[PDB]
Design a protein around this ligand. Structure first.
Ligand SMILES: Cc1cc2nc3c(=O)[nH]c(=O)nc-3n(C[C@H](O)[C@H](O)[C@H](O)COP(=O)(O)OP(=O)(O)OC[C@H]3O[C@@H](n4cnc5c(N)ncnc54)[C@H](O)[C@@H]3O)c2cc1C
Ligand SMILES: [Cl-]
Length: 416
């Protein structure tokens, strides 16, 4: 046993785990499949890396819908503000942008990766690139060895699994970690994509009626209800995309899986600022100002023209009908479609194409203060391989950095 701790995976969690263990005085090996460490980290935040989020604790947890509450213990030890200080000290100043989102002053993800690599070098962590792991050996409820794809055996009593999820496999995250966890006794929460476009075969989608149409600042709901507020949506050839749709997508997936229906209902509130009474009266007070003018001109500007004209048809209103020859029941209907237009949807894009993989190693089986397995001694987990996931805004890297630091410092401590 040359190595006190072996960390498998050099994403943000693995890099923090290796630093965490080496600070505890352990001789640490960090293994990665790729020719470079931090490939996904290097593309994160549009190439700038949204490293963390400075919002208060309770808001951070709320933005991590996949087991955010599990992180309460971790955050007591090492939290968002601690992340900011940590990076400052490694010479990579951060800045705050919108909605609490923190980015390097350099505006370059590579800056973050390089700082972490420099700290590993300073601490004497051994790094082996192009070194894929095949499996982990366990005996007597304890970790015994890491087995490389080549067959090379690396004996150790402390292994940190930091290999990420299943999305964007070109970066190295191909779901290798789940089988190792199962071998160790763990359950895997069923995997689902997050932040992906939603599919629909509604006739109006198939006939491209609204294709390319952006609806700005809408409320998009998944009915049963889960609601994304004041975000933009886009109608595509295949369904719904844009921030509002992407946010709802994990909820579409779960629902379809739980229930075994072919479609589920979504609802679009195109004008969330205004209630159906205010909107109805707005519309009357305009139909009276110009009762001889065509309704398609009297009521322009409420929603984009293509959506407007589609909804008129749907409600059997001739756009050229005189504003004072349109029945008030048919206007009430138009207002209901402005506030709650239903769209049946029937799936989403795949996990390969997702932002983050939802599901993973169950956190019920992990000691929250340690990131240690409850089943196998000398086994630790961190990052996206765990069943933790965040919305966009820095939350996923927050969790990876935090869990990686706790897992690493616990391993390094245990190994001594
Ligand atoms: C396009 C994109 C942009 C993103 N932007 C942000 C953002 O701005 N902010 C944010 O908070 N989140 C962002 N995310 C998500 C965030 O990048 C991830 O959640 C995070 O990188 C997960 O960190 P990790 O350490 O768990 O795993 P990863 O970063 O996925 O790293 C895992 C490492 O494990 C290695 N590995 C895998 N299998 C093996 C094996 N068998 N043997 C050896 N090594 C192996 C891989 O080569 C890889 O280097 C983004 C995601 C995507 C895809
Ligand atoms: Cl993000």
């Amino acid at each position: 046993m040359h190595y006190d701790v072996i960390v498998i995976g050099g994403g943000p969690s693995g890099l923090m785990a290796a630093i965490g263990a080496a600070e505890e005085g352990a001789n640490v090996l960090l293994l990665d499949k790729g020719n470079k460490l931090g490939r996904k980290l290097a593309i994160s935040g549009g190439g700038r890396c949204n490293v963390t989020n400075r919002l208060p604790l309770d808001e951070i947890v709320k933005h991590i819908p996949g087991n955010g509450r599990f992180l309460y213990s971790a955050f007591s030890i090492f939290n968002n503000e601690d992340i900011i200080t940590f990076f400052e000290n490694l010479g990579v100043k951060l800045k705050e942008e919108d909605h609490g989102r923190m980015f390097p002053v350099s505006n370059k993800a590579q800056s973050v990766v390089d700082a972490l690599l420099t700290r590993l070098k300073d601490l004497g962590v051994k790094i082996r690139t192009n070194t894929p792991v095949e499996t982990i050996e366990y005996e007597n409820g304890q970790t015994k060895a890491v087995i490389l794809q080549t067959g090379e055996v690396l004996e150790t009593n402390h292994v940190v699994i930091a290999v990420g999820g299943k999305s964007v496999p070109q970066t190295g995250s191909t779901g290798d970690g789940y089988a190792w966890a199962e071998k160790a006794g763990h359950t895997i929460t069923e995997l689902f994509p997050t932040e992906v476009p939603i599919l629909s075969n509604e006739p109006f989608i198939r006939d491209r009626s609204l294709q390319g149409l952006a609806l700005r600042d809408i409320n998009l709901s998944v009915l049963n209800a889960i609601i994304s507020h004041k975000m933009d949506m886009l109608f595509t050839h295949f369904g719904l995309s844009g921030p509002a749709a992407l946010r709802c997508s994990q909820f579409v997936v779960k629902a379809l899986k739980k229930f075994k229906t072919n479609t589920i209902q979504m609802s679009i509130d195109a004008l969330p600022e205004e209630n159906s009474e205010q909107l109805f009266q707005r519309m009357l007070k305009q139909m009276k100002e110009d009762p001889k003018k065509g309704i398609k001109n009297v009521l322009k500007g409420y929603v984009p023209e293509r959506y407007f004209l589609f909804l008129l048809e749907k409600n059997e209103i001739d756009g050229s009908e005189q504003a004072g020859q349109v029945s008030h029941e048919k206007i009430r209907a138009l207002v209901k479609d402005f506030k709650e237009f239903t769209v049946n949807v029937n799936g989403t894009q795949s996990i390969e194409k997702a932002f983050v993989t939802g599901g993973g190693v169950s956190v019920k089986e992990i000691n929250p203060k340690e990131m240690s397995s409850k089943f196998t001694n000398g086994l630790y987990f961190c990052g996206e391989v765990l069943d933790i996931h965040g919305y966009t805004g820095g939350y996923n890297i927050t969790s990876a950095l935090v869990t990686g630091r706790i897992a690493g410092t616990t391993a390094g401590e245990n190994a001594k």
